[PDB]
Amino acid sequence: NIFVSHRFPERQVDLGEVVMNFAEAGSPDNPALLLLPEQTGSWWSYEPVMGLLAENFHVFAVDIRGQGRSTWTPRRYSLDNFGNDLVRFIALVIKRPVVVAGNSSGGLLAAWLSAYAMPGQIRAALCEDAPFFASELVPAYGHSVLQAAGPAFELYRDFLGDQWSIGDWKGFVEAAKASPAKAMQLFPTPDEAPQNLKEYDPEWGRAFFEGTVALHCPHDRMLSQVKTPILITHHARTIDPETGELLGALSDLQAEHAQDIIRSAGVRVDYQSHPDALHMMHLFDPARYAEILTSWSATLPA
Amino acid sequence: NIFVSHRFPERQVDLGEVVMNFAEAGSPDNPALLLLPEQTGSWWSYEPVMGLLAENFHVFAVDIRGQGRSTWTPRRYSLDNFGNDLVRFIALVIKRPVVVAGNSSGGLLAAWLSAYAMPGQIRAALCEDAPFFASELVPAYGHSVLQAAGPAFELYRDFLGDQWSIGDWKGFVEAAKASPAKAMQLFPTPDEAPQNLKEYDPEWGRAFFEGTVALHCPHDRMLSQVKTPILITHHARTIDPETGELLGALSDLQAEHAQDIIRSAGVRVDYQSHPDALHMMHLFDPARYAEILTSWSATLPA
Numbered sequence A, B: 001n002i003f004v005s006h007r008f009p010e011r012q013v014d015l016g017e018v019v020m021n022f023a024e025a026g027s028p029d030n031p032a033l034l035l036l037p038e039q040t041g042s043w044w045s046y047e048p049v050m051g052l053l054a055e056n057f058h059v060f061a062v063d064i065r066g067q068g069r070s071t072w073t074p075r076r077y078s079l080d081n082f083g084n085d086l087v088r089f090i091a092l093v094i095k096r097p098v099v100v101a102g103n104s105s106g107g108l109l110a111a112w113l114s115a116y117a118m119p120g121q122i123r124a125a126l127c128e129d130a131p132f133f134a135s136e137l138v139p140a141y142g143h144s145v146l147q148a149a150g151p152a153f154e155l156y157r158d159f160l161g162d163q164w165s166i167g168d169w170k171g172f173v174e175a176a177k178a179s180p181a182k183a184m185q186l187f188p189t190p191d192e193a194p195q196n197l198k199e200y201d202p203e204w205g206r207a208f209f210e211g212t213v214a215l216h217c218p219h220d221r222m223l224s225q226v227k228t229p230i231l232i233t234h235h236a237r238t239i240d241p242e243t244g245e246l247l248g249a250l251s252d253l254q255a256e257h258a259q260d261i262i263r264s265a266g267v268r269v270d271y272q273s274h275p276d277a278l279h280m281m282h283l284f285d286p287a288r289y290a291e292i293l294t295s296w297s298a299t300l301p302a
């Protein structure tokens, strides 16, 4: 009960297990657009850009399970459960085919739906800076989660704890600043826990760090099972020259393989590299993100 | 393409990732009934009893993913993925509230649905000798899969292999007889691979033995989340005095706790002990099973 006000009305739908919170904008005569936030991001990660997209889409921004006003589900955090929630959401609330756009963790889920959603649910998928492979424990190519974003997710577990059962925010901030992981500086460490983190279940991080979230969803297989056109945006990424860490969502090599996997599935795939963009372009450069999304959606078949 | 003819015509439906095969009997004027086979059993596990149930029910017998003519999905075998398939099947095919009756592993999925199905999909669930706890790697109570049926699933994996990739049936029968597990005698060892097993993906067994099939579906939490009346039929079970092995689906101690967890959820629960009935009662005593189901179904609301 730590939530705040926002610039769109919020509504909740019972999917069976999770009660998913979401916001709605746009005209139902425009194409439906499902927005999936990143890890630690609530639906209002897209709040600045929703005004822009609502001009041309009927947009649905949702709180994914274990986040925001949506239901926290201990012991049940997996890409399969995340995606099937979204399958039920599309079927119970949207009731039309959708273009799905997801940032990072949400990008993995946009690709998850394009491969494993109910027939006809997904017209196309936008993957904004998705950590393909780089979020797996034992990826088929390139850095593992332990060599990229792992350290921050490990701290969420060790200091915030499942369902905020530890809550040592001060201890987390000090461990983060003192961590030898160069990628740790990509995660914010304010003196007071930010709103999005307070709406976040740290067992997300435990699941990504321990390799359990995508145990049943190997990325090389998921990417080969997609059935709808996919757009891959690749933002800032660098390999630290002292520690070898991946500072970014995925490496150049991992993005190449993901393109080749999709291409071999016979599915249209486009790739845009934005090496100066921030990880969450939809939030910190919503104008640029809206243009990319709106333009790419215009090239999709009706 | 090793399938055999059957009394009831078969039909397939695309659920998105799994193309599910099923057989339909009875009239839509009677209550819908979804039958879930056991592990290694296809829909025609119920073929001998569907004639009786078709006199009072709109019967749907399905091949669960990784079994029969339903899709085999390597690496994605989980209770959540099994259940979400069945959620899709009810939504796409049945389109009406159902009573779910599953045997063994299928009983776990009936309870899974009672907890995690879409709102209104499930009227009640019948769990026929379901291995609650005894099929978990680290159960909350009682024996683990390693002290029950695990040894047989271990042989399925070692000698048959994922997707019948090893296929050393004669090596399996040899290892089954030499096994020190007294519970090994509950599993068939014919000179030729039985038909039901040739339609079965042994990665099923790997998942139950390695503790991955229900890693994200702890039974104690799942049972606490049921939302519909439950009927638990407990068939033959015995504890070996030397090795302590559980010979059967679940122990008396486990069944008692499952009753407690459901009762504390404020949900109706009934418990019928048939300690002389075989595991697959619906197959070897179809009249007895059908009567139990039909009599119990009569006491349901609406």
Ligand SMILES: C[C@@H](O)CCCC(=O)CCC/C=C/c1cc(O)cc(O)c1C(=O)O
Pocket (backbone or CB within 6 Å): B038, B039, B040, B103, B104, B105, B106, B131, B134, B135, B136, B145, B148, B149, B150, B186, B187, B188, B208, B247, B248, B249, B279
């Ligand atoms: C070959 C198959 O029919 C099993 C043999 C039946 C029998 O004679 C006694 C064992 C009862 C429990 C089995 C069981 C146990 C588990 O831990 C998990 C399962 O999925 C089953 C399961 O069968 O689904």
Ligand SMILES: C[C@@H](O)CCCC(=O)CCC/C=C\c1cc(O)cc(O)c1C(=O)O
Pocket (backbone or CB within 6 Å): A038, A039, A040, A103, A104, A105, A106, A131, A134, A135, A145, A148, A149, A150, A186, A187, A188, A208, A247, A248, A249, A279, A280
């Ligand atoms: C931390 C945030 O402010 C972004 C700053 C740039 C950065 O940290 C590297 C890019 C990958 C970032 C996160 C990430 C990593 C994963 O392995 C999985 C994820 O779901 C995310 C995720 O959901 O964001």
